[PDB]
Design a binder for this molecule. Structure first.
Ligand code: NDP
Length: 416
């Protein structure tokens, strides 16, 4: 067992004194390990925390070149480096106030004036967050103790998150105060909710845990290394016909196959030649299932969400359309009759430049799928192909501006 340079428990609980005392000692310790470029970036964060954090959330959805060209990128990289420089040797429970809207809870838990939360609102929230996984991204300031009478409590919802071992964590001094920065970039599940009391006021204390997954985002190189490490031998695991049908599908056969599946052709107008191809691709995706929890990205178009390019509801530049889309699709299961093309990379691609929906899918361990880019000769970038007839539970929808165009990020989980 590793002896920490500055000893602490996994949870400081309500002990603000010992927490701040440890946070000050560890801010001082890490300061010494930091680079000038990193220290300078931490000074840039103090002043412009909101814009720097908003950037770190949606930076990986732009083109590879737009990332290298952005004036906010070096600052992101340095801050990322400073936090990643101090990975925790053991877990740490962190505390932060969250909006219930972060979990698609559109109802008011309790007003500022109100002290009580009703059983009705408590149970409705529990029903909303239960059996779901929500992605948490971008730079965030967190607390190392449970807030008390004297501390700032901006929402009736308190997140009590267990950050696992090797999580990047950066404690730092900001004038007289001390704070801890995390980059996030993980799936959380809320296991239990408790109605706690802080200074004669009710608060929902959400017990959250990190459900580890691979998320390469814009690091398509690291993902390509992963996919090839696991799927460089996938071709030899298939029968000559399975490989032939997989190659044919990837080399342009996908159009006839997916259109046939979307139109319910196996029932309406059966094509036995296409049915054999489908049977073979599906079996090939079941040979070596996704070995670890893997986050994939899909540039989705309007028809996938019952819309058209001419549809006024697809204009996400009008807020009313984002609200309408969120209302209709949050908490809903999205079925794909066709095989699904996804990438290990979140970056924008030339062929899907106009696609206003980014489908961020969390593939759980053991799901049918394969990294097809481990087979040369395919138009697609860093592809992972998901089985036909897959269901995606949309947990949360977020917007962002890809220049003039407002686009959506749909946080979906592949349902087994
Ligand atoms: N899209 C991506 O993020 C990725 C794509 N690729 C590559 O992109 C190329 C073309 O792929 P792509 O367009 O994604 O392939 P699809 O088979 O998914 O889509 C082709 C057409 O089908 C429609 N469509 C797709 N899914 C549905 C659905 N469930 N219901 C209704 N209509 C649907 C699309 O319309 P609409 O868009 O309006 O729904 C589109 O016009 C291939 O070479 C592939 O390898 C590779 C990796 C990732």
């Amino acid at each position: 067992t590793y002896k920490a340079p500055i000893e602490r428990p996994e949870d400081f609980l309500k002990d603000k004194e010992k927490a701040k005392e440890w946070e000050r000692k560890e801010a001082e310790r890490i300061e010494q390990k930091l680079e000038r470029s990193e220290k300078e970036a931490l000074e840039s964060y103090k002043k412009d925390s909101v814009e720097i954090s908003k950037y770190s959330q949606t930076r990986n959805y732009f083109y590879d070149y737009q990332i290298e060209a952005n004036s906010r990128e070096k600052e992101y990289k340095e801050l990322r480096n400073a936090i990643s420089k101090n990975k925790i040797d053991k877990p740490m429970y962190v505390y932060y106030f969250e909006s219930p809207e972060k979990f698609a809870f559109n109802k008011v838990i309790r007003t500022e004036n109100q002290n009580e939360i009703s059983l009705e609102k408590f149970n409705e929230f529990k029903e909303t967050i239960q059996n779901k996984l929500f992605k948490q991204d971008g730079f965030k300031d967190i607390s190392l103790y449970e807030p008390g009478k004297g501390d700032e409590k901006p929402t009736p919802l308190l997140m009590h998150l267990k950050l696992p071992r090797n999580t990047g964590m950066l404690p730092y001094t900001n004038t007289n105060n001390v704070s801890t920065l995390i980059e996030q970039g993980y799936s959380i599940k809320i296991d239990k909710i408790v109605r706690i009391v802080i200074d004669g006021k009710h608060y929902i204390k959400a017990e959250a845990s990190v459900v580890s997954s691979l998320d390469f985002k814009d690091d398509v190189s690291k993902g390509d290394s992963w996919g090839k490490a696991n799927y460089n031998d996938w071709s030899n695991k298939l029968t000559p016909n399975e490989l032939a049908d997989v190659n044919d599908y990837m080399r342009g056969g996908y159009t006839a196959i997916n259109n046939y599946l979307i139109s319910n052709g196996p029932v309406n107008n059966p094509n036995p030649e296409l049915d054999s191809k489908i049977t073979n691709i599906e079996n090939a995706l079941k040979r070596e299932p996704i070995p670890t929890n893997l986050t994939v990205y899909r540039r989705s178009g309007p028809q996938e969400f019952g819309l058209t390019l001419t549809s006024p509801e697809y204009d996400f530049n009008k807020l009313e359309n984002i609200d309408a889309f969120k209302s209709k699709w949050e908490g809903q299961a999205l079925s794909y009759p066709n095989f699904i093309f996804t990438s290990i990379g979140s970056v924008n691609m030339s062929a899907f430049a106009k696609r206003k929906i980014v489908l961020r899918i969390t593939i759980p361990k053991g799901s049918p799928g394969a990294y097809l880019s481990a087979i040369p000769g395919y138009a697609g970038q860093y592809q992972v192909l998901l089985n036909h007839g897959s269901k995606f539970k949309i947990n949360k929808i977020d917007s962002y501006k890809d220049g003039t165009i407002t686009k959506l990020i749909v946080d979906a989980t592949l349902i087994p």
